């Protein structure tokens, strides 16, 4: 019988997703899950999120092509430092990629080009969207006083239940019910990582929604007021910020009384303000692009 | 005997005493055309001759004609002027 080699899985603005991309990220996420010990759900729920990530990636790649952004070979050389984890394992060749694709070179190099191009255009657009006000910087700096108040550092897992920019009340209550159900499951004992892989519109869904270690002030504010009162492992109910309902889990926390001795505090405060602004504008702009873009999943 | 309306049959190109007095021997064809205008009649049978005919037939009053013949040389320089103010 004839064997299907490749096919179009999704149609986007003048682009197509091939089945050799869904499978690649499927194997990637399965391998990461196996190394991370975190069990992952059934073929279809994992497939929907991978397809969504690929639609968003294709949209961003076509925007980069339209806008005349290209990547240098030295950028690939630098990405070899972290993308291939050469610093952790001392070997240059593609024999480290033992899992799948037969240790091929071109495939992983193109994958890295895909990530660098997405990151570059994402950064450029989000940076061009940021507005900084001197008053806010002064306020945040004066907040950064009294022995570096709120020096709490957090590693958190996040889940986003999306809503369109102009949603209907029907959609509002649907999203509300979904978010409350996820929150109830998380609070009742369900593993948040498994919930995050199954139920999430964020880019980090495929990674389980982990945001990594950060500082509370870096939060867009929508999370910090609720988050100041929470212990390790707690589940925070649904919130809003324009892009949909938000759910947060406190994976880990670590605090210390270190104080940096303003001359050097203003620059740091500007850094954290830029971090929060980038995180919020990135989420808003990625949601806007998803709503605007043309797409027709294929089956 | 011929008591029927006949319109004026104007033929040729308008000539005035001043214009006819502006041209002189030695003038080039461009200067003559500038002074008198493009001739409505030339010699097509192998000569550089320009005919400035001025016909007027107001009706049954009788036709009048002034014919000015300008003969140029091969180089385009006016060589001879022959002005006939009335018919024979």
């Amino acid at each position: 019988a004839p064997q299907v080699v490749d096919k179009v899985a999704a149609v986007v603005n003048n682009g197509v997703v091939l089945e050799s991309d869904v499978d690649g990220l499927m194997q990637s996420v399965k391998l990461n899950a196996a190394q991370a010990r975190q069990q992952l759900p059934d073929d279809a729920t994992l497939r929907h999120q991978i397809m969504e990530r690929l639609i968003m990636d294709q949209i961003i790649l076509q925007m980069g092509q339209k806008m005349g952004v290209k990547i240098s070979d030295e950028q690939l050389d630098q990405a070899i430092a972290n993308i291939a984890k050469q610093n952790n394992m001392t070997l240059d060749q593609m024999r480290s990629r033992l899992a799948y694709d037969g240790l091929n070179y071109n495939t992983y190099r193109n994958q890295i080009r895909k990530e660098m191009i997405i990151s570059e255009v994402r950064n450029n657009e989000v940076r061009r969207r940021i507005t900084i006000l001197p008053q806010e910087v002064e306020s945040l700096a004066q907040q950064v006083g009294n022995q570096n108040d709120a020096s709490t550092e957090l590693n958190l897992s996040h889940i986003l239940i999306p809503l369109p920019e102009n949603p209907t009340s029907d959609q509002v209550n649907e999203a509300e019910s979904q978010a409350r159900a996820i929150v109830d499951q998380a609070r009742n004992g369900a593993d948040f990582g498994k919930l995050a892989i199954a139920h999430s519109a964020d880019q980090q869904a495929l990674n389980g929604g982990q945001m990594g270690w950060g500082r509370i002030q870096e939060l867009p504010g929508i999370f910090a007021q609720a988050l100041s009162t929470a212990k390790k492992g707690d589940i925070v109910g649904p919130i809003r910020s324009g892009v949909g309902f938000h759910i947060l889990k406190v994976n880990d926390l670590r605090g210390e009384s270190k104080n940096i001795s303003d001359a050097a505090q203003k620059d740091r405060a500007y850094r954290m303000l830029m971090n929060r602004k980038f995180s919020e504008e990135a989420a808003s702009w990625m949601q806007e692009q998803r709503a605007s873009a043309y797409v027709k999943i294929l089956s | 005997e011929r008591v029927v309306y006949r319109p004026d049959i104007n033929q040729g190109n308008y000539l005035t005493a001043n214009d006819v007095s502006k041209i002189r021997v030695g003038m080039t064809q461009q200067q003559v055309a500038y002074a008198l205008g493009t001739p409505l009649m030339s010699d097509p049978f192998g000569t550089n001759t320009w005919f400035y005919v001025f016909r007027q037939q107001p009706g049954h009053e009788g036709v009048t004609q002034q014919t000015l013949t300008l003969t140029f040389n091969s180089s385009g320089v006016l060589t001879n002027i022959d002005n006939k103010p009335a018919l024979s």
Partner: protein
């Protein structure tokens, strides 16, 4: 009128109706093909058949439009000589009349616009494609159109001789001598030019024209 059968069956019906000799239903079928399938194995063939059927049906404006579009779309087509011949034919066809022809009326006095256009197209065909299959008939038609145009000029010159506009007569006959020197109408017009010269008392030029007449009427 036109069903929704595949292009193959529509073309088969159009060919059958052209062979039968009915132009209107065949015109409908080829127009359906052209509008519905502007590309494919049948393209250009439909346009050639449309030109032929429009010509045979006396739909001359549509034949001209089809010929123009075909020429401007497929200048390199091997059978473009046929298209130019059909352009000449449809322009000559626009130059004729039925009732006047029935009554034996000489139409050379009427508008020569279409005859001029037909002459231009036939000259283009003959010069561009000397070896074409239609070159002999095109040459014969050119000789006829040249005679017609010279006769039109002669008619105008004769009228102005009647009116008494001698400059107009001289200019018309000179234009005939410069444009249609070898037509019979030019030989007939020369006496008009001589008379016009004499009436203006330009005896030297009347003498030259009389010399020409004596040297050639013999």
């Amino acid at each position: 009128e036109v069903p929704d059968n595949p292009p193959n069956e529509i073309y088969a019906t159009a060919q059958q109706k052209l062979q039968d000799g009915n132009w209107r239903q065949a015109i409908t079928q080829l127009e359906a093909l052209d509008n519905r399938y502007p590309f494919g194995p049948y393209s250009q063939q439909v346009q050639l058949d449309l030109i032929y059927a429009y010509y045979k049906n006396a739909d001359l404006p549509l034949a001209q439009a089809a010929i123009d579009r075909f020429i401007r779309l497929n200048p390199t087509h091997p059978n473009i000589d046929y298209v130019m011949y059909m352009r000449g034919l449809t322009n000559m066809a626009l130059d004729d009349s039925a009732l006047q022809g029935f009554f034996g009326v000489d139409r050379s006095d009427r508008d020569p616009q279409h005859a001029r256009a037909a002459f231009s197209d036939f000259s283009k065909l003959v010069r561009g494609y000397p070896n074409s299959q239609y070159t002999t008939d095109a040459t014969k038609r050119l000789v006829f159109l040249k005679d017609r145009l010279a006769k039109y000029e002669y008619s105008v010159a004769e009228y102005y001789t009647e009116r008494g506009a001698w400059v107009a007569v001289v200019n018309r006959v000179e234009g005939m001598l410069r444009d249609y020197p070898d037509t019979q109408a030019t030989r007939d017009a020369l006496p008009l030019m001589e008379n016009a010269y004499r009436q203006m008392q330009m005896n030297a030029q009347a003498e030259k024209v009389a010399k020409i007449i004596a040297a050639n009427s013999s």
